[PDB]
User: Fold this.
Amino acid sequence: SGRRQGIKKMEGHYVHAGNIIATQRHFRWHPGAHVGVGKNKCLYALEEGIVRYTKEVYVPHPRNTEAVDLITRLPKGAVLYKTFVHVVPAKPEGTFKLVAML
Amino acid sequence: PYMTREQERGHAAVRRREAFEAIKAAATSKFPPHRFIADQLDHLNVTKKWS
Amino acid sequence: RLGFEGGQTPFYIRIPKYGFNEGHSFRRQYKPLSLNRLQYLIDLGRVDPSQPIDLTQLVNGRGVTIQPLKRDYGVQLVEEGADTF
Amino acid sequence: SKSKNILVRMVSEAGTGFCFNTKRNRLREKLTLLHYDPVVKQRVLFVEKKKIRSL
Amino acid sequence: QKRREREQHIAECMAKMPQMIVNWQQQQRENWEKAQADKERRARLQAEAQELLGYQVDPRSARFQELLQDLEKK
Amino acid sequence: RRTPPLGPMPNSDIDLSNLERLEKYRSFDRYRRRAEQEAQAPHWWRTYREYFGEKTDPKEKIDIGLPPPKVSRTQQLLERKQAIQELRANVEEERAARLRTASVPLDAVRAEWERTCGPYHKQRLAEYYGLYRDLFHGATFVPRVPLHVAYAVGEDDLMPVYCGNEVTPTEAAQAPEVTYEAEEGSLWTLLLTSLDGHLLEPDAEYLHWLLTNIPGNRVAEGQVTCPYLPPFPARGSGIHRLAFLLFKQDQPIDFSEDARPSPCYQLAQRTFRTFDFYKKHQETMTPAGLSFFQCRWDDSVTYIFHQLLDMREPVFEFVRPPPYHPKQKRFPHRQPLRYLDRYRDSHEPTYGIY
Amino acid sequence: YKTKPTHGIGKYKHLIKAEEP
Amino acid sequence: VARKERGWRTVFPSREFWHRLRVIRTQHHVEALVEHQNGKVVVSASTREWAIKKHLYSTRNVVACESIGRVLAQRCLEAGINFMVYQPTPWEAASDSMKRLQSAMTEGGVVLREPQRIYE
Amino acid sequence: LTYFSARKGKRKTVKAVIDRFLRLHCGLWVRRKAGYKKKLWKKTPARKKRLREFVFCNKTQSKLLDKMTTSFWKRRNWYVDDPYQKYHDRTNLKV
RNA sequence: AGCAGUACAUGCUAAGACUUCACCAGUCAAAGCGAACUAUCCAAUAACUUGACCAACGGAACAAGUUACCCUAGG
RNA sequence: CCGAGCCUGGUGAUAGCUGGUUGUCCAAGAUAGAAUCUUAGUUCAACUUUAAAUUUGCCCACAGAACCCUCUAAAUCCCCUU
Ligand SMILES: [K+]
Ligand SMILES: [Mg+2]
Ligand SMILES: [Mg+2]
Ligand SMILES: [Mg+2]
Assistant:
């Protein structure tokens, strides 16, 4: 009676757009640059590139009542940190090619 | 150790790659052996006798 | 027996029925004859363009094979090779 | 026999005939909705018509 | 003919739809406002509490609803 | 197995013994202000700045411009403080501010801005647009001399160039009117370069205009080392950067090596690199002023190619990489029927041998 | 991750005084 | 066609922009910045500048915030910046200072909304 | 499965397979999803859409279906205006 | 846990992925269009659809006791 | 040996589970899982044979994978070089 959830793509792995980076019951890894979130908190790549995991300062949305209450009660000088997953775009959006010589 | 991890890096790359090419070349050269007429006609000698 | 999994519902049974093949035996079929094939047949002298070309001449020149028992209703001329016809 | 919610079929008022089942509270009047209607490609009034099942 | 009848039936009903949607939205707001009054109606009963601590059923509170019905009647 | 941190861990100075006595943020804004500050700081652990932040030489950018002007801070602070006390003294000023009817003269602000922070804001804009990266290979200068370039559009109108604003090639058909503050006796060089226009070499530029040995503000009297040529951004090639550079010469300079014929309609002869041109004359002239505008193709460009340049107009398109698909498999289990269309090249029916 | 030096970089409940519901 | 940095859905503010307007209000001054998503500051207007400060009775009031918007809008057009995103908090958006500053930007030609990316 | 019919001594086709599967001439088998018509009210739009897809069978299933049908069901057919005509032949398949 | 709240674009379509795993089933989703712009068969139905506490829950369409008179089976 | 006679035929009846299964040589070759009126059996899995096509496989540097209090160590995943 067990299921498989966790990191599908580890650090430095190459992902294509739409690849599921990780599956989680709760937010253990947060969406970074070019990483989308699903309804079930699934993390997926929005661009083709290399997966990177970093530690970034956490700032919740002002309307996230539950999270805003936490940060307001923190001692001044203390910053919350979380683990974020990013995708570093490997290719350019496009190139300019000569098509005609009018 | 005679070399550090950084200096060892890539020193054997060329040989390691060429060795795999030999493995690849052997694995793609499989084909049925040639068939020769002399082999088939030679079987007629089973009935070879002194005149 | 083949198709028995030892107790569970077989895969070929648990899939729902859908009319993929419904009425297949009554569907009309047409053998495709391309302009490439028609031109090739004319080039090799197997179909003569100087006379009316019908199913008999196409069949006689071995250009097409018609199976009436397999619901073939004739030949359907297809545009493949139109550029060089 | 009794359920908190009822499954009922909403029919479009446009007369196209598109209908979708919807959930409403048992103790409520006939439901009317502005659900989207594919046939007309725009939102249209939907009128509750027939009870399908009880949840 | 069947296609045309369905096409004409849809067109006729669609013509009446904009007015029907407007009328429907009005009855929604009407009931939306009645709901707002329902909240304040219970508040009015509390106004007649006269420092009554108990949250149990109050005869005056129920009677005032009947009295309000009497006020409406004319 | 645990590894000691490779440096000070976050939220470690915070004394947990007296948590209740510590001062809390109490507000989202205060936490956010501290959060942004912490993010900017460098950290031993992996951060977004590492992978996405641009990698640039740590050594400070060389400054090749004119020296900063000398200012007496004590006198400057004295006059400014007295000016504000005079302004605040007026009852009408206080009433206008309280009633929210007061406003600032935009024209007067820009006049003072040009004298004070404008050179440093133009440098920031030039840095953001990559002019220093592409013109001087990362060397930077502060445009101390405000350069005013305007294109006469029609008879009574003028299209100004303000460091990045868009000017169409039609408006730039003729040489612009250039003015700047120059003391008597000074000599200046003015060039116009297209950073993104070159059709053959990625790193090269086109010399659209080059005036040398300009005496003071009299641009017309300066020698025409290269006749003016309108910007011709190719259709579909995007937005191009056109940068006017003003150089303050230290003495008369011989530009015969950089001379070009009149008229010059050969793109090979107008191929230009500002870094190489400045490098040979760095001893004698210093970058003084900078203006630039953004240009994209317009109908007037076609005339330049066919008539002035006597060539066919090149057209470009923005082409994206072909969509990625996994390697097709013989049995695409659980994939929709349309899976086979992803690997299909022709939409028309095929008949094989038949 | 536990083994890595950055283990615990995102712990915050110690910073907040525990409250019993 | 340039890709915006999508993601960061669980944190504030969003990174999905090319340029954004950021307003920094201090105890004594008002500052408005236009910066690229990569963190570079394209143009800026601040009450600390003498050019603006000398025409202001106060540098911390609504009039100062409106004046910064009018000045920044002019500098934006000169720099070729016509579109940007503004990411305020609920209280900042409601405040009259930001309403006046936003109005000055829109009346100055800045749209305060960026065009969508063209994926295809 | 009948390998040798009582009257003809010939292999027989499993008609259960014909009812549920479509065989493309390339050897692929197409089927419907189980329960695509059942209890739609309690299924999300995304689940309903994948339930109405025509999906391919895996290698193991395809070989089993091939054994259960005789050669007649594997012949090439030229039906007029067949919706699956293009899918009968594979394209750009290296393997 | 075998539910409820509360919305009614839980619209259409479509790259790329995940999955208790084997299958069946299940899950996430860019772009785009349009909006907003904040189990199987069986049985009923015109259609769209609905229905077995099939709880032994991969479910035979539908069936209990007893044998110390016992019969057969191997371990 | 009649808790229901015997004989022939249906009949080489069915099930269940044992037992047996006949020359030589060479090559490869031992896995330990899921569903089921299913656990003395089976079919998809695990391992295994032959042929074929092609290109990496194994070992494994750093970096990297969560908070919630981790018994927290012994380890794992990922992984260039070799
Ligand atoms: K170029
Ligand atoms: Mg979308
Ligand atoms: Mg052996
Ligand atoms: Mg490896």
In short: Chain D has no helices and six strands. The first strand of chain D starts at residue 5 and ends at 12. Chain D has one domain: 4-55.
